[PDB]
Amino acid sequence: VNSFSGYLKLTDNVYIKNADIVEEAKKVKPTVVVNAANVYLKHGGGVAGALNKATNNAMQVESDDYIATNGPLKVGGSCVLSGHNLAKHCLHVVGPNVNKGEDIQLLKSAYENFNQHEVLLAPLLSAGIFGADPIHSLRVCVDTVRTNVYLAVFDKNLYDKLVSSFL
Numbered sequence: 001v002n003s004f005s006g007y008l009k010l011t012d013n014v015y016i017k018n019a020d021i022v023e024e025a026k027k028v029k030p031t032v033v034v035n036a037a038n039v040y041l042k043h044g045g046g047v048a049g050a051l052n053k054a055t056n057n058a059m060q061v062e063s064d065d066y067i068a069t070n071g072p073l074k075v076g077g078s079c080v081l082s083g084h085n086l087a088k089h090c091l092h093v094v095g096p097n098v099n100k101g102e103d104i105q106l107l108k109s110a111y112e113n114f115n116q117h118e119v120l121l122a123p124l125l126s127a128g129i130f131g132a133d134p135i136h137s138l139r140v141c142v143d144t145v146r147t148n149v150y151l152a153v154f155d156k157n158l159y160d161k162l163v164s165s166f167l
């Protein structure tokens with residue numbers, strides 16, 4: 001038993017809700033919140049900008065030190081950093097950004113990072129400003145992630161669509 005509420009169950013291990021991931025995180029304090037990161041950990045907009053703003057820019061400060069020490073992430077890769085006031089940990093995961101021409105097949109590799117964590121609150125990778133089809137992203141999520149994932153979808157309209165078209 002865990003503290004997530006109001007989720008619709010899609011599969012044995014995948015759950016979905018129309019919610020703002022920022023407010024969802026401040027209420028659950030999940031062990032892991034996933035950020036829709038880029039390779040530079042520049043949290044300017046989308047989910048990343050919203051999460052970072054909710055940390056009063058502490059996420060960005062920590063991220064800049066990480067990059068200065070380690071260099072950029074790989075597309076499809078991830079790193080674990082602090083969750084600040086939102087979660088114990090933040091798993092920064094880089095899905096491919098279609099608006100940069102990145103290979104969509106890397107979306108499966110990106111979701112594989114979720115399997116290193118027993119339970120996660122997460123957005124749909126490569127959705128939103130990353131330009132992928134959220135329905136394809138949901139399919140890859142369901143077919144790749146084996147751990148327990150709670151997907152927060154900000155847009156109510158999108159959410160209804162994802163549910164109604166789910167196979």
Ligand SMILES: C[C@H](Cc1ccco1)C(=O)N[C@H](CC(=O)O)c1ccc2c(c1)OCO2
Nearest residue numbers: 046047123127128129134152153154155158
């Ligand atoms: C089709 C809709 C358009 C839309 C955007 C906002 C409302 O509708 C869409 O791309 N949605 C994705 C996925 C989602 O809805 O979780 C998304 C991603 C990041 C976000 C985000 C929304 O909003 C805040 O950061």
